[PDB]
Amino acid sequence: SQIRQNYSTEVEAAVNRLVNLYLRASYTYLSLGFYFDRDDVALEGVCHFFRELAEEKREGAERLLKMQNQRGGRALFQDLQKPSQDEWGTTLDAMKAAIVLEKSLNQALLDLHALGSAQADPHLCDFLESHFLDEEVKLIKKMGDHLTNIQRLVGSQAGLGEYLFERLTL
Amino acid sequence: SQIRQNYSTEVEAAVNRLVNLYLRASYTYLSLGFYFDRDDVALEGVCHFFRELAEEKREGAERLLKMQNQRGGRALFQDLQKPSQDEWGTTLDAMKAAIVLEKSLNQALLDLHALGSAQADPHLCDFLESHFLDEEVKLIKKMGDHLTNIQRLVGSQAGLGEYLFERLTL
Amino acid sequence: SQIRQNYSTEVEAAVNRLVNLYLRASYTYLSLGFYFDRDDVALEGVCHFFRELAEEKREGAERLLKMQNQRGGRALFQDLQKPSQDEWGTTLDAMKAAIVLEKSLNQALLDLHALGSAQADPHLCDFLESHFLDEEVKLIKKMGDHLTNIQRLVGSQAGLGEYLFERLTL
Amino acid sequence: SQIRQNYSTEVEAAVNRLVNLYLRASYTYLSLGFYFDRDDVALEGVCHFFRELAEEKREGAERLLKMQNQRGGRALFQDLQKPSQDEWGTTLDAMKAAIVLEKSLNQALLDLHALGSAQADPHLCDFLESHFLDEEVKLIKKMGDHLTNIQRLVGSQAGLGEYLFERLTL
């Protein structure tokens, strides 16, 4: 491409697997969203938390793809994996799977940043910094807050903690 | 009647028993409404839920009767039955009786739709679809949500779940 | 599920494959969107057409899943397939693949409607009618309009037709 | 200077040659601007594209010089070179020379960023990132879009593509 500059073939490919992970994640959030809208869960606020997330992750991957073109990279598509479970258990378990999820997402950006500097690509590095690493770490903090509060509430009487959580946090 | 068209005598009659069930239901909702406003219950939000319902069901039966005339059918009136119980127990029990209630109501429309197509009456079929089947299924989902949440809250300590339910859902 | 009524196990499963096709389609639209934003295509209006579509299809599948829960069905997830090609050729070829795409989507609803009536499920039938079959057929008309206009423009001088198309239709 | 900190003599000098290139570029844009306003070209939109650019590049160099002082560096001035040609040919050729131009500009920032990290100067690195590398890559994408569209239009009938381009892109 006549507009590409200092954008390594390694970076291009690695970005695209990052693209795939974000989209996998959005789709994983969808599944979770509608799991807590199963009548035998029925917690609107949990659903509403995860609704906003399905929108969030997709917005990032589009952001990336905008940049992909800006650097003159090629989008490469492969299948987007199904979520690993059908039932997510209690909210405690659901938020736990959410947290493994965001961990890996930050991991991916981290490893892509590090690849970026070992390949001497400074634009790519700042792009990640501006719109992404920051969203992640704000959101991770928030998730953590939730999880610790969740556990401190379940220990006593299971359903009660769960209900007040949905109603009164979200 | 010179305005009636393709409206079988069977349909006419079966509509009217549907009319009767909706009105029975509105009146059943009234009884429930004022049961939870008994001082030895006293849960405004439960009362308020059921107040809106007594208005809802009557509104449907009027809708039907509007259509009865539109098709040139005859309203036929019989006694409207009293609710089957005087005390509705805990909110758990009340919402359960509400749910048997809406089930039968959807049943009635379903059987009337099916009668409609075995009698080749397409207007009637769409009428049910537009203003009714849809309200039912939205409302059924909602009831279900409530019931599952109710049960998950009672198990621990009876009154507490019941209070937070009324306050914090409705 | 305690809220489910007259919703066959066949319907449940068939809906879910419809869910999968809509989501496959949204993701197929994404790939197309960013293909025409490749610098060696660069047609904002084509991109903008397909951007709105990626949002449209996902909106439908969410609609469906709303209904899935409303009927007390279970979401079932499998992998969501990658688009079948990496380059979409000229706009002529791209819009052609778009059109195969919408055809199959209407097909799926059609077959699901017909399954619906062979299984005597009238709610499901009207649901498809209200929010879906209609969007499809409006959108198909529109696509068709585009394609015929596209072909009538390319025959003469290839790039010129393509540019005026993007600029002056979209 | 009593306010300077961790700002190498190499960086200072290299910044100033970057200053010179931006200013050279603004002045190169001026020449191009007025070339397409030659009556025997006369394409307002091309002129208007390049008018905005002459303002853009100068705005950057001022930005830099602001930072020069902020770090306690010394502005160093040398002659600012004339554009390399008097006639820019067709718009195809003009945009091509524009694109060589922006390439070198991003090159300069890249090499200055890399000099920055081999000299361990982290403020300088982020400064480039915030107000510059980003403008470049947005603008490069845009130029590219133009050029590809330009070529796809000229091949057929030369003047026609050129006119519709000026009118209907810009």
UniProtKB/Swiss-Prot annotation, chains A, B, C, D:
Residues 52-59 are annotated as: Catalytic site for iron oxidation. InterPro entries: Ferritin, Ferritin-like, Ferritin-like_diiron, Ferritin-like_SF, Ferritin_CS, Ferritin_DPS_dom. It is found in: Cytoplasmic vesicle, Autophagosome; Cytoplasm; Autolysosome. The keyword Acetylation applies. Its main location: cytoplasm. Residues 5-154 form the Ferritin-like diiron domain. One of its GO terms (biological process) is intracellular iron ion homeostasis. In horse spleen the light chain is the major chain. Belongs to the ferritin family. This is Ferritin light chain. It comes from Equus caballus (Horse).
